[PDB]
Amino acid sequence: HTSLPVRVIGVDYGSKTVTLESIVKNTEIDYPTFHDVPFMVNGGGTGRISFPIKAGDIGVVVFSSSGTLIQPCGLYPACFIPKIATATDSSEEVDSEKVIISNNKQTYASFDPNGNISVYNTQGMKIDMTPNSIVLTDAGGGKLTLQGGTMTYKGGTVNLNGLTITPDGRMTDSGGIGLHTHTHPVRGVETGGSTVTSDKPN
């Protein structure tokens, strides 16, 4: 019926209810407050999606035990509707082809219609899936790739329970034994002046 621009004073994260304060002068009082006023939540059965509505947020109140109904507007004496900013959206928060979950232009999960899935942050850290690959991207200079039935890591030092592999692909176990630098002591021979080469390992 009638509505007003409003500021979120406080939120009840259990009741799915907010406390609101008019930001403009109404019609005695001037800045009316509204208590235990509910808002729409997304869910059904045991599942749900929660959005970070918090004190300081702007929106609009509309009007004329234990819950809780997911769509309370029209059937409650009043409800709160967030008026979120979208005008400055880039192709990353809003797309023509992708389903995009995002928070504060900082965290993303995008699902494209062709088999590409991307979970990432603006800092460059990425978990990516394409029709034929899974790739983990470390913006710090590392990349793990599963593709074509092969696995690859390209980046810096690899560490497996102490065992180490350099950025250039040399390895040394936890004990210091290096595959390319190690030597063997040989027993029971005559100190000579010749040099022979051993066989491959046993």
Q: How many CB atoms neighbour CB 78 within 10 A? A: 20
What is the rounded CA–CA span in Å between residue 120 and residue 150? Answer: 23
17 binds, options a second copy, K ion, none, Cβ within 5 to 8 A by partner type = none
User: What is the token pair recorded at 92?
Assistant: 């990353």
- Applying CB under 8 A, which of residues 25, 30, 64, 187 lies at the interface with a second copy? 187
Task: Dihedral sign for Cα 142, 139, 97, 53, please.
Answer: positive
Burial label for 120, CB within 10 Å (0-12, 13-18, 19+), is: middle
* 124 lies in the site for K ion, by CB under 5 A: no
Residues contacting residue 13 through CB under 8 Å, at least 6 positions apart: none
Nearer to a second copy, 30 or 200 (CB): 200
94 binds, among K ion, a second copy, none (CB under 5 to 8 A by kind): a second copy
Residues contacting a second copy: total by CB under 8 A: 142
Structure tokens at 18: 């907010």
CB of 29 to a second copy, least distance (A): 24
Which residue is associated with the tokens 């409650």? 76
Q: Is 33 in the site for a second copy (CB under 8 A)?
A: no
Nearer to a second copy, 29 or 87 (CB): 87
In terms of CB distance, is 21 or 138 closer to a second copy?
138
Residue 161 in contact with K ion, rule: CB under 5 A? no
Distances (CA, A) of 107 to 83, 97, 136, 143: 20, 19, 16, 20
Segment 127 to 156, residues that bind a second copy, using CB under 8 A: 127, 129-134, 136, 138-142, 144, 146-156
Cα separation, 146 vs 72, whole angstroms: 46
Compose the 166-195 pattern: x for residues touching K ion by CB under 5 A, - for all others: ------------------------------
List 5, 77, 124, 156, residue binding K ion (CB under 5 A): 156
Return the residue nearest K ion (CB atom).
156
CA-based nearest residue to 37, from 156, 67, 169? 67
Among 86, 88, 157, 191, binds K ion (CB under 5 A): 157
Q: What is the DSSP letter of 31?
A: S
Residue 29 contact partner, candidates a second copy, K ion, none, CB within 5 to 8 A by sort of partner? none
- When asked if residue 121 is in the footprint of a second copy (CB under 8 A), the reply is yes
